[PDB]
Amino acid sequence: LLDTFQGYNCYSSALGEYAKQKNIDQVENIILSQWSFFFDEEQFYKNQWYTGAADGPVDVVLNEDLRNFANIEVLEHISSESQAIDEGRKVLEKHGLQIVLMDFYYMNSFNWKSLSRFNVTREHDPHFAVLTQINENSVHIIDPYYHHEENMSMEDFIKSRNSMTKQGKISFNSYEIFSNGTKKSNIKELLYYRFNRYLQEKMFGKITQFGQVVKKQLDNKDRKWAFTGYNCLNSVVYQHQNLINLQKKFSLEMPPNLQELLDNWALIRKKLFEYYSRGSYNTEEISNLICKVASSEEQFAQEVLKVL
């Protein structure tokens, strides 16, 4: 496990790892101060990523925050097999790193056997990685979200960047952190804006919506939603850990139950993974834990604005 920037999703992980290595100001703090939750019932029933911090793979709300706070744009470069690797060489020569969208089917970033899951189904999902080296017949990539690196054959790398996925077709997409006129934001301004937006958009209500949909899965023999949910909610654990780390670094005033809320989310994840793999009939229990944390998160957001 590499010491890479975690962010709260593969997109923010890649952006922050890039910003860390290349000394790009503001990006890391804007990521670490994010506070968000979404729920898409239509995506739930399509076996797509349906909850957690953000819809993806690109986090459009984070891009809006980067533009609004730092006047930072994340430029999407689409390419072709004729041009993509040459463009990579030009970027590596100048910057030493290129942010790329890859089909995770061709990556082996997370060891599921560590959690006693030996039936590891390959899926065509877009995932952000950082290209660090182009050789004749191989590339080196860092997956900062999963703290993993690998050497990939040029053949497999090209396949991973031209692949049809569950979310659509990758076409050698690469991402450039660009600014013409950056701005500095204080960490308290970033958190104030995020917590006000969380309450105004009633994002805690999306947690309740998620709980209500879980309760209605008691008769669903297809438990894949619980595995998807488990993976989706890592983003929420990471935002809670990021806010704990901001509190320590900036000596911030926080409501006293932040660690308890992180523990509540970790337990919800543990129960979803157990439900998925152990065939338990405890959708009501998991629903109850989710509906409880929704109420606690509403109160926590109100309290942050009072003490910050």
Q: Note the maximum CA span of the chain.
A: 57
* DSSP one-letter code for 49: -
Resolution value in angstroms: 1.4
Per CATH, which fold does 10-32+73-178 belong to?
Cathepsin B; Chain A (3.90.70)
- Report the alpha-carbon distance of residue 56 to residue 60 in Å, rounded: 8
Distance of CA 185 to the CA centre of its chain: 23
67 within 8 A of 183, measured Cβ to Cβ: no
Whether the bond into 57 is cis, omega within 30 of 0: yes
Quote the tokens at residue 111. 């060891």
Strands 98-103 and 168-169: unpaired
The closest alpha carbon to 277, from 269, 289, 266, belongs to 269
* DSSP one-letter code for 222: -
The closest alpha carbon to 275, from 237, 226, 234, 232, belongs to 226
- Report the alpha-carbon distance of residue 198 to residue 305 in Å, rounded: 11
Structural determination approach? X-ray
Long-range pairs, 156-162, Cβ under 8 A, ≥24: 156/106, 157/102, 157/106, 158/81, 158/84, 158/85, 159/103, 159/106, 160/102, 160/103, 160/105, 160/106, 160/107, 161/84, 161/100, 161/101, 161/102, 161/103, 162/81
- Can you spell out the DSSP letters for 109-157? -S-GGGGT---------EEEEEEEEE-SSEEEEEEGGGTEEEEEEHHHH
Quote the tokens at residue 49. 């990523």
User: 225 phi and psi, to 5 degrees?
Assistant: -50, -35
